[PDB]
Structures are given as structure tokens and as C-alpha cells.
mmCIF file of C-alpha atoms in Angstrom:
data_model
loop_
_atom_site.group_PDB
_atom_site.id
_atom_site.type_symbol
_atom_site.label_atom_id
_atom_site.label_comp_id
_atom_site.label_asym_id
_atom_site.label_seq_id
_atom_site.Cartn_x
_atom_site.Cartn_y
_atom_site.Cartn_z
ATOM 1 C CA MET A 118 18.514 29.027 2.370
ATOM 2 C CA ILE A 119 15.022 29.393 0.897
ATOM 3 C CA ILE A 120 16.444 26.039 -0.065
ATOM 4 C CA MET A 121 14.854 24.415 2.885
ATOM 5 C CA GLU A 122 11.326 25.550 2.224
ATOM 6 C CA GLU A 123 12.057 23.906 -1.142
ATOM 7 C CA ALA A 124 13.318 20.582 0.204
ATOM 8 C CA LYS A 125 10.161 20.607 2.365
ATOM 9 C CA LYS A 126 7.836 21.257 -0.539
ATOM 10 C CA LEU A 127 9.367 18.341 -2.498
ATOM 11 C CA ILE A 128 9.176 15.821 0.245
ATOM 12 C CA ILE A 129 5.602 16.767 1.151
ATOM 13 C CA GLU A 130 4.620 16.379 -2.533
ATOM 14 C CA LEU A 131 6.382 13.067 -2.792
ATOM 15 C CA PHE A 132 4.496 11.575 0.121
ATOM 16 C CA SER A 133 1.214 13.148 -0.877
ATOM 17 C CA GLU A 134 1.450 11.385 -4.219
ATOM 18 C CA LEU A 135 2.636 8.029 -2.943
ATOM 19 C CA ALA A 136 -0.347 8.052 -0.592
ATOM 20 C CA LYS A 137 -2.705 8.814 -3.451
ATOM 21 C CA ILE A 138 -1.032 5.771 -5.012
ATOM 22 C CA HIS A 139 -1.649 3.302 -2.143
ATOM 23 C CA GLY A 140 -5.335 4.239 -2.441
ATOM 24 C CA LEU A 141 -5.133 6.807 0.336
ATOM 25 C CA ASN A 142 -5.803 10.515 0.792
ATOM 26 C CA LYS A 143 -3.041 12.921 -0.300
ATOM 27 C CA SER A 144 -3.239 14.583 3.172
ATOM 28 C CA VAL A 145 -2.400 11.378 5.063
ATOM 29 C CA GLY A 146 0.808 11.446 3.005
ATOM 30 C CA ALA A 147 1.038 15.224 3.310
ATOM 31 C CA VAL A 148 0.811 15.004 7.134
ATOM 32 C CA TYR A 149 3.394 12.250 7.357
ATOM 33 C CA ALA A 150 5.636 14.509 5.294
ATOM 34 C CA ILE A 151 5.450 17.227 7.985
ATOM 35 C CA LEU A 152 6.186 14.736 10.815
ATOM 36 C CA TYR A 153 8.894 13.014 8.747
ATOM 37 C CA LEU A 154 10.717 16.311 8.625
ATOM 38 C CA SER A 155 9.912 17.475 12.118
ATOM 39 C CA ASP A 156 12.660 16.662 14.627
ATOM 40 C CA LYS A 157 10.182 17.048 17.479
ATOM 41 C CA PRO A 158 6.598 15.917 18.051
ATOM 42 C CA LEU A 159 3.837 18.040 16.595
ATOM 43 C CA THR A 160 0.260 18.595 17.757
ATOM 44 C CA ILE A 161 -2.800 18.755 15.495
ATOM 45 C CA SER A 162 -2.869 22.572 15.506
ATOM 46 C CA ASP A 163 0.846 22.612 14.653
ATOM 47 C CA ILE A 164 0.282 20.436 11.609
ATOM 48 C CA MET A 165 -2.684 22.557 10.565
ATOM 49 C CA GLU A 166 -0.481 25.630 10.211
ATOM 50 C CA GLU A 167 2.280 23.778 8.381
ATOM 51 C CA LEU A 168 -0.147 22.494 5.779
ATOM 52 C CA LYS A 169 -3.159 24.726 6.332
ATOM 53 C CA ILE A 170 -6.119 22.279 6.416
ATOM 54 C CA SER A 171 -9.127 21.746 8.658
ATOM 55 C CA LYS A 172 -8.610 20.165 12.100
ATOM 56 C CA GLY A 173 -10.478 17.161 10.831
ATOM 57 C CA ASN A 174 -8.405 16.534 7.696
ATOM 58 C CA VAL A 175 -5.423 16.469 10.017
ATOM 59 C CA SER A 176 -7.084 14.221 12.613
ATOM 60 C CA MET A 177 -8.157 11.630 10.082
ATOM 61 C CA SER A 178 -4.798 11.627 8.292
ATOM 62 C CA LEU A 179 -3.199 11.063 11.644
ATOM 63 C CA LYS A 180 -5.728 8.328 12.384
ATOM 64 C CA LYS A 181 -4.820 6.644 9.118
ATOM 65 C CA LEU A 182 -1.109 6.806 9.896
ATOM 66 C CA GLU A 183 -1.514 5.303 13.388
ATOM 67 C CA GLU A 184 -3.448 2.481 11.833
ATOM 68 C CA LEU A 185 -0.585 2.024 9.358
ATOM 69 C CA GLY A 186 2.054 2.434 11.991
ATOM 70 C CA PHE A 187 4.095 5.333 10.610
ATOM 71 C CA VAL A 188 2.954 7.679 13.367
ATOM 72 C CA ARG A 189 2.352 7.230 17.094
ATOM 73 C CA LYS A 190 0.970 9.492 19.829
ATOM 74 C CA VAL A 191 3.387 11.295 22.153
ATOM 75 C CA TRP A 192 2.899 12.735 25.682
ATOM 76 C CA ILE A 193 4.789 15.862 26.917
ATOM 77 C CA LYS A 194 5.124 16.588 30.621
ATOM 78 C CA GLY A 195 2.947 19.552 31.590
ATOM 79 C CA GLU A 196 1.003 19.275 28.313
ATOM 80 C CA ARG A 197 -2.693 18.783 27.846
ATOM 81 C CA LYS A 198 -2.625 18.192 24.088
ATOM 82 C CA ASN A 199 -1.753 15.034 22.170
ATOM 83 C CA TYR A 200 1.540 15.144 20.333
ATOM 84 C CA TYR A 201 2.562 12.965 17.434
ATOM 85 C CA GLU A 202 5.802 11.815 15.816
ATOM 86 C CA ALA A 203 6.942 9.723 12.874
ATOM 87 C CA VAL A 204 7.927 6.141 13.673
ATOM 88 C CA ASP A 205 11.178 5.057 11.972
ATOM 89 C CA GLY A 206 9.892 4.993 8.446
ATOM 90 C CA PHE A 207 11.718 1.921 7.140
ATOM 91 C CA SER A 208 11.415 -0.219 10.239
ATOM 92 C CA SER A 209 7.596 0.131 10.175
ATOM 93 C CA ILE A 210 7.694 -1.074 6.559
ATOM 94 C CA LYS A 211 9.617 -4.204 7.465
ATOM 95 C CA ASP A 212 6.892 -5.039 9.938
ATOM 96 C CA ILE A 213 4.221 -4.650 7.258
ATOM 97 C CA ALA A 214 6.214 -6.540 4.642
ATOM 98 C CA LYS A 215 6.373 -9.331 7.243
ATOM 99 C CA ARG A 216 2.744 -9.407 8.355
ATOM 100 C CA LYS A 217 1.754 -9.504 4.682
ATOM 101 C CA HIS A 218 4.196 -12.360 4.264
ATOM 102 C CA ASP A 219 2.966 -14.455 7.176
ATOM 103 C CA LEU A 220 -0.619 -13.964 6.121
ATOM 104 C CA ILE A 221 -0.071 -14.918 2.461
ATOM 105 C CA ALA A 222 1.986 -17.955 3.451
ATOM 106 C CA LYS A 223 -0.513 -19.119 6.120
ATOM 107 C CA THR A 224 -3.182 -18.981 3.364
ATOM 108 C CA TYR A 225 -1.065 -20.788 0.803
ATOM 109 C CA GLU A 226 -0.546 -23.486 3.457
ATOM 110 C CA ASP A 227 -4.204 -23.849 4.442
ATOM 111 C CA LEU A 228 -5.088 -23.840 0.717
ATOM 112 C CA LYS A 229 -2.637 -26.759 0.458
ATOM 113 C CA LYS A 230 -4.355 -28.681 3.260
ATOM 114 C CA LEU A 231 -7.643 -28.436 1.411
ATOM 115 C CA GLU A 232 -5.912 -29.697 -1.700
ATOM 116 C CA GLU A 233 -4.798 -32.638 0.483
ATOM 117 C CA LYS A 234 -8.329 -33.997 0.677
ATOM 118 C CA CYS A 235 -9.540 -32.464 -2.604
ATOM 119 C CA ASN A 236 -7.402 -34.841 -4.670
ATOM 120 C CA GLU A 237 -7.132 -37.215 -7.612
ATOM 121 C CA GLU A 238 -8.442 -35.395 -10.711
ATOM 122 C CA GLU A 239 -9.961 -32.556 -8.763
ATOM 123 C CA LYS A 240 -6.685 -31.721 -7.091
ATOM 124 C CA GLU A 241 -6.029 -30.153 -10.490
ATOM 125 C CA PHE A 242 -9.111 -27.992 -10.455
ATOM 126 C CA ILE A 243 -7.741 -25.948 -7.543
ATOM 127 C CA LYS A 244 -4.306 -25.443 -9.094
ATOM 128 C CA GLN A 245 -5.513 -22.480 -11.108
ATOM 129 C CA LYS A 246 -6.175 -20.038 -8.270
ATOM 130 C CA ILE A 247 -3.592 -21.560 -5.890
ATOM 131 C CA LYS A 248 -0.813 -20.646 -8.328
ATOM 132 C CA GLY A 249 -1.734 -16.980 -8.026
ATOM 133 C CA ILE A 250 -1.596 -17.083 -4.214
ATOM 134 C CA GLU A 251 1.665 -19.018 -4.622
ATOM 135 C CA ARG A 252 3.234 -16.099 -6.543
ATOM 136 C CA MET A 253 1.993 -13.682 -3.949
ATOM 137 C CA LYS A 254 4.235 -15.665 -1.640
ATOM 138 C CA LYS A 255 7.358 -15.571 -3.825
ATOM 139 C CA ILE A 256 6.963 -11.839 -4.104
ATOM 140 C CA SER A 257 6.880 -10.975 -0.411
ATOM 141 C CA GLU A 258 9.765 -13.379 0.237
ATOM 142 C CA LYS A 259 11.993 -11.120 -1.806
ATOM 143 C CA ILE A 260 10.351 -7.821 -0.952
ATOM 144 C CA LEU A 261 11.131 -9.086 2.568
ATOM 145 C CA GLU A 262 14.459 -10.519 1.375
ATOM 146 C CA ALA A 263 15.553 -7.314 -0.302
ATOM 147 C CA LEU A 264 14.394 -5.552 2.888
ATOM 148 C CA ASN A 265 16.790 -7.563 5.088
ATOM 149 C CA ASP A 266 19.704 -6.580 2.802
ATOM 150 C CA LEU A 267 19.563 -2.966 3.879
ATOM 151 C CA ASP A 268 20.238 -3.499 7.603
ATOM 152 C CA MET B 164 -16.649 -29.992 -3.749
ATOM 153 C CA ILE B 165 -17.787 -27.595 -1.011
ATOM 154 C CA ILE B 166 -14.019 -27.254 -0.947
ATOM 155 C CA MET B 167 -14.313 -24.603 -3.585
ATOM 156 C CA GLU B 168 -16.607 -22.545 -1.415
ATOM 157 C CA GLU B 169 -13.990 -23.204 1.228
ATOM 158 C CA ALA B 170 -11.116 -21.995 -0.961
ATOM 159 C CA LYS B 171 -13.335 -19.099 -2.084
ATOM 160 C CA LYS B 172 -13.703 -18.097 1.571
ATOM 161 C CA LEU B 173 -9.905 -18.354 1.980
ATOM 162 C CA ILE B 174 -8.998 -16.071 -0.862
ATOM 163 C CA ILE B 175 -11.740 -13.575 0.099
ATOM 164 C CA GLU B 176 -10.371 -13.653 3.637
ATOM 165 C CA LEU B 177 -6.860 -13.251 2.283
ATOM 166 C CA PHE B 178 -7.711 -10.098 0.293
ATOM 167 C CA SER B 179 -9.909 -8.519 2.970
ATOM 168 C CA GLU B 180 -6.919 -8.486 5.270
ATOM 169 C CA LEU B 181 -4.374 -7.026 2.847
ATOM 170 C CA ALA B 182 -6.695 -4.042 2.340
ATOM 171 C CA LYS B 183 -6.969 -3.476 6.092
ATOM 172 C CA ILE B 184 -3.142 -3.510 6.367
ATOM 173 C CA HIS B 185 -2.778 -1.039 3.462
ATOM 174 C CA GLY B 186 -5.254 1.129 5.361
ATOM 175 C CA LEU B 187 -8.202 0.234 3.100
ATOM 176 C CA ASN B 188 -11.663 -1.121 3.935
ATOM 177 C CA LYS B 189 -11.826 -4.889 4.246
ATOM 178 C CA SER B 190 -14.519 -4.658 1.533
ATOM 179 C CA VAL B 191 -12.004 -3.132 -0.920
ATOM 180 C CA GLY B 192 -10.141 -6.454 -0.562
ATOM 181 C CA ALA B 193 -13.172 -8.709 -0.461
ATOM 182 C CA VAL B 194 -14.508 -7.179 -3.687
ATOM 183 C CA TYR B 195 -11.209 -7.813 -5.491
ATOM 184 C CA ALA B 196 -11.382 -11.485 -4.382
ATOM 185 C CA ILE B 197 -14.782 -11.867 -6.112
ATOM 186 C CA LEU B 198 -13.538 -10.427 -9.410
ATOM 187 C CA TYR B 199 -10.207 -12.150 -8.787
ATOM 188 C CA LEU B 200 -11.972 -15.469 -8.428
ATOM 189 C CA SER B 201 -14.519 -14.844 -11.161
ATOM 190 C CA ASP B 202 -14.074 -15.878 -14.798
ATOM 191 C CA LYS B 203 -16.488 -13.324 -16.127
ATOM 192 C CA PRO B 204 -17.123 -9.601 -15.655
ATOM 193 C CA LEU B 205 -19.664 -9.005 -12.919
ATOM 194 C CA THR B 206 -22.030 -6.132 -12.212
ATOM 195 C CA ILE B 207 -22.263 -4.267 -8.957
ATOM 196 C CA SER B 208 -25.432 -6.319 -8.213
ATOM 197 C CA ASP B 209 -23.643 -9.619 -8.959
ATOM 198 C CA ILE B 210 -21.056 -8.919 -6.301
ATOM 199 C CA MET B 211 -23.559 -7.779 -3.721
ATOM 200 C CA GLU B 212 -25.105 -11.208 -3.556
ATOM 201 C CA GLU B 213 -21.641 -12.775 -3.731
ATOM 202 C CA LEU B 214 -20.635 -10.907 -0.583
ATOM 203 C CA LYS B 215 -24.043 -9.793 0.697
ATOM 204 C CA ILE B 216 -23.214 -6.101 1.310
ATOM 205 C CA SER B 217 -24.882 -2.752 0.479
ATOM 206 C CA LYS B 218 -24.994 -1.155 -2.999
ATOM 207 C CA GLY B 219 -22.849 1.508 -1.394
ATOM 208 C CA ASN B 220 -20.256 -0.749 0.133
ATOM 209 C CA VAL B 221 -19.700 -2.232 -3.334
ATOM 210 C CA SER B 222 -19.482 1.165 -5.053
ATOM 211 C CA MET B 223 -17.130 2.305 -2.332
ATOM 212 C CA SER B 224 -14.831 -0.707 -2.841
ATOM 213 C CA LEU B 225 -14.976 -0.599 -6.675
ATOM 214 C CA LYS B 226 -14.057 3.057 -7.182
ATOM 215 C CA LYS B 227 -10.995 2.478 -5.040
ATOM 216 C CA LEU B 228 -9.914 -0.627 -6.899
ATOM 217 C CA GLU B 229 -10.184 1.277 -10.148
ATOM 218 C CA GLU B 230 -8.172 4.065 -8.550
ATOM 219 C CA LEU B 231 -5.434 1.634 -7.437
ATOM 220 C CA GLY B 232 -5.851 0.024 -10.830
ATOM 221 C CA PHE B 233 -6.729 -3.568 -10.073
ATOM 222 C CA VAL B 234 -10.178 -3.514 -11.550
ATOM 223 C CA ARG B 235 -11.482 -1.725 -14.646
ATOM 224 C CA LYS B 236 -14.956 -1.071 -16.019
ATOM 225 C CA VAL B 237 -16.063 -3.346 -18.819
ATOM 226 C CA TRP B 238 -18.947 -2.954 -21.235
ATOM 227 C CA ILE B 239 -21.214 -5.726 -22.537
ATOM 228 C CA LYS B 240 -23.133 -5.535 -25.834
ATOM 229 C CA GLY B 241 -26.850 -4.941 -25.151
ATOM 230 C CA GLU B 242 -26.349 -4.234 -21.407
ATOM 231 C CA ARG B 243 -27.321 -0.902 -19.829
ATOM 232 C CA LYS B 244 -25.245 -1.590 -16.691
ATOM 233 C CA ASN B 245 -21.520 -1.541 -15.943
ATOM 234 C CA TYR B 246 -19.350 -4.579 -15.524
ATOM 235 C CA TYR B 247 -16.091 -4.925 -13.618
ATOM 236 C CA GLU B 248 -13.176 -7.307 -13.920
ATOM 237 C CA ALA B 249 -9.896 -7.543 -12.080
ATOM 238 C CA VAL B 250 -6.939 -6.534 -14.226
ATOM 239 C CA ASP B 251 -3.807 -8.638 -14.567
ATOM 240 C CA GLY B 252 -2.932 -8.745 -10.917
ATOM 241 C CA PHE B 253 0.862 -8.856 -10.802
ATOM 242 C CA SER B 254 1.054 -6.609 -13.832
ATOM 243 C CA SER B 255 -0.912 -4.002 -11.876
ATOM 244 C CA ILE B 256 1.744 -4.315 -9.149
ATOM 245 C CA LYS B 257 4.615 -3.784 -11.564
ATOM 246 C CA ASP B 258 3.036 -0.487 -12.550
ATOM 247 C CA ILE B 259 2.682 0.696 -8.966
ATOM 248 C CA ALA B 260 6.249 -0.309 -8.085
ATOM 249 C CA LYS B 261 7.490 1.971 -10.912
ATOM 250 C CA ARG B 262 5.404 5.081 -10.196
ATOM 251 C CA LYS B 263 6.654 5.041 -6.605
ATOM 252 C CA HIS B 264 10.181 4.448 -7.805
ATOM 253 C CA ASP B 265 9.939 7.293 -10.310
ATOM 254 C CA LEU B 266 8.582 9.671 -7.723
ATOM 255 C CA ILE B 267 11.215 8.692 -5.180
ATOM 256 C CA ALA B 268 13.984 8.750 -7.773
ATOM 257 C CA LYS B 269 13.075 12.239 -9.069
ATOM 258 C CA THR B 270 12.816 13.739 -5.584
ATOM 259 C CA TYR B 271 16.187 12.186 -4.601
ATOM 260 C CA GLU B 272 17.604 13.763 -7.730
ATOM 261 C CA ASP B 273 16.062 17.148 -6.901
ATOM 262 C CA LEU B 274 17.256 16.946 -3.259
ATOM 263 C CA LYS B 275 20.817 16.651 -4.456
ATOM 264 C CA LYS B 276 20.477 19.789 -6.647
ATOM 265 C CA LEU B 277 19.358 21.836 -3.636
ATOM 266 C CA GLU B 278 22.344 20.331 -1.843
ATOM 267 C CA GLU B 279 24.450 21.555 -4.785
ATOM 268 C CA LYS B 280 23.822 25.134 -3.837
ATOM 269 C CA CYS B 281 23.192 24.565 -0.095
ATOM 270 C CA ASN B 282 26.801 23.693 0.583
ATOM 271 C CA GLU B 283 30.022 23.887 2.558
ATOM 272 C CA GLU B 284 29.041 23.120 6.170
ATOM 273 C CA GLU B 285 25.301 23.194 5.560
ATOM 274 C CA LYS B 286 25.508 20.717 2.706
ATOM 275 C CA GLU B 287 25.925 18.429 5.708
ATOM 276 C CA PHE B 288 22.728 19.665 7.345
ATOM 277 C CA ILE B 289 20.543 18.342 4.497
ATOM 278 C CA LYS B 290 22.109 14.893 4.713
ATOM 279 C CA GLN B 291 19.774 13.836 7.546
ATOM 280 C CA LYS B 292 16.379 13.770 5.814
ATOM 281 C CA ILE B 293 18.122 12.836 2.566
ATOM 282 C CA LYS B 294 19.569 9.453 3.630
ATOM 283 C CA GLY B 295 16.001 8.494 4.459
ATOM 284 C CA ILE B 296 14.754 9.352 0.989
ATOM 285 C CA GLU B 297 17.858 7.634 -0.357
ATOM 286 C CA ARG B 298 16.893 4.406 1.392
ATOM 287 C CA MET B 299 13.427 4.520 -0.103
ATOM 288 C CA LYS B 300 15.226 4.628 -3.443
ATOM 289 C CA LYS B 301 17.272 1.481 -2.836
ATOM 290 C CA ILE B 302 14.136 -0.256 -1.658
ATOM 291 C CA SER B 303 11.922 0.471 -4.690
ATOM 292 C CA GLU B 304 14.858 -0.608 -6.838
ATOM 293 C CA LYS B 305 14.835 -4.144 -5.497
ATOM 294 C CA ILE B 306 11.106 -4.597 -5.089
ATOM 295 C CA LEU B 307 11.248 -3.363 -8.680
ATOM 296 C CA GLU B 308 14.237 -5.571 -9.477
ATOM 297 C CA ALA B 309 12.573 -8.562 -7.835
ATOM 298 C CA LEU B 310 9.363 -7.926 -9.789
ATOM 299 C CA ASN B 311 11.384 -8.063 -13.044
ATOM 300 C CA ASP B 312 12.786 -11.457 -12.013
ATOM 301 C CA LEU B 313 9.407 -13.164 -12.222
ATOM 302 C CA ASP B 314 8.717 -12.601 -15.912
#
């Protein structure tokens, strides 16, 4: 079962990439890979040995993931260090897909209130850019929609 | 027609916040809103005054947008400088939804193959971290699906 070092390698590379895709550092994604596979919390030093990277590259990557919400800090009785663990991957996505949806909609609504007053022949001037923000809404309704079809 | 400035400020505020949720700098989203709202390619300097930020905050934000592929350099005849312009928004999201899907897909394919060999009673051991990566597949299929339901 050298198999498992292989399944590990794959997963870690998947996440590294994806992260490079969302405009983030490969590590951030590399570190979440480690945690995603871990069945127990891991400290900074732990993660450093599993990926072999400075203490800082690990700390930042962790910092990015706490911002995002995929990772949270964990406290172990009798322990001085700060542990970490991967939040339920998919649930944390739902949350994001929903914040992004309430934000985009709130904007599309406010943008509508300004089109209330801005009317007549000018009401049409705004319709260019509002129709882009109006798509942004139809997209997160489904990306949300599709998300509440898997639970 | 201050309204416009008002709508401007909405859209800029909308994009600043979607960059801070995707773990990016608020600038990275503000910048996109300038090029998003503009009808012509701008220069780094043009945007600075548009958002009143440093020549570094703009360069920061613009290299990332190019990375993520929402903005692309543009050249003007008789102009020593560089110009930037947002790319076709939603098109640039179709492309990202596929890369992710093709990375996820592949890996999920490759994870099976290791489960081909790794079998019997252990074939069952792999099934934990796999059903996670299998979910991510069904998700990028719909957010993909959904995106190919708008054109």
C-alpha cells in the first residue's frame, strides 16, 4: 500500500492547483490537502514535515484558510501549541455560495432603487451595467440551487 | 446624474467584497470594477486616480486579475505604456469552472485506479476521502451545467 502515499500526492496536487486557480498560493491549497486527509488536528510543525516548507509558508496558508473558512483552530487539553483541522469542506462552500448570493442580490436591489428615481429616458442609461449584475444573480441562484440538491 | 457616480460606487463596492470573500485584496475587486465599468482600456495611472491608491496597490491588483484571467494587457498604437481591459466576464468564469472540473474529474478517475489495486477489505478504507472528492465532482458538474444554461 504505497498506494496511500499516492492517493495523498494526488489530492495535495489537486488542491494546490485549484488554489492557484482561485488566485491563491499553491501552499494554501497544499496545506488544506494535508488537513483534508488528516483524521486528527495538526500543528504548524506537523504540517511542515508533511509538506516540508518554512514555518511561515505554513502559517500564512493557514491564515488564508481561516479567513476562507475551510480550517479552524483547535485546542488540545494539556497542549501549549495551536492545532488546526479542516472544516467540513462542502458545508463551508454552501456558506460562501450564500454570502456571495446575498451580497449580489442586495446590490442588484439597491441598484434598482436608484433606477427608481433615475427614470424616464435615463432609466435606460443604467440598464447596461445593471444587466451584468443581474446575471451575477442568476448564476449564484443556481450555484446555490445546485448546492441544495446534494443534501 | 450623480446617480452614475452612485452606481459606480455600488459596483466597485460589490467587487471589492467578492475579492475579500475569495481571499483576495479588496483592491483586486475594486480594480476589476473600474475596468468592468470602463468602456476603454485604461493605464495603471488612469485607475489610480479612479480609485486613488498607490502605484503598487494597482500593480498588485492587476497582476492577480491577469492571473485569474479577468483582465488582459492591451497595447495602443503610439503609446509607450500598458493598457488593461476586463475580459468577457462570464466567459472568464466558464473557463475557470472547467479547469476545476477537469482537475477534480481526473483525480477522481485516478483515485479509483488506486482503489482498483488497493482492494478487498481495504478498497473500503479509501472510500472515506474519496466520497469527498466525488462530491466536488458532482458540484463542478452543475455549476458547469448551470453555466451552459445561460448561453
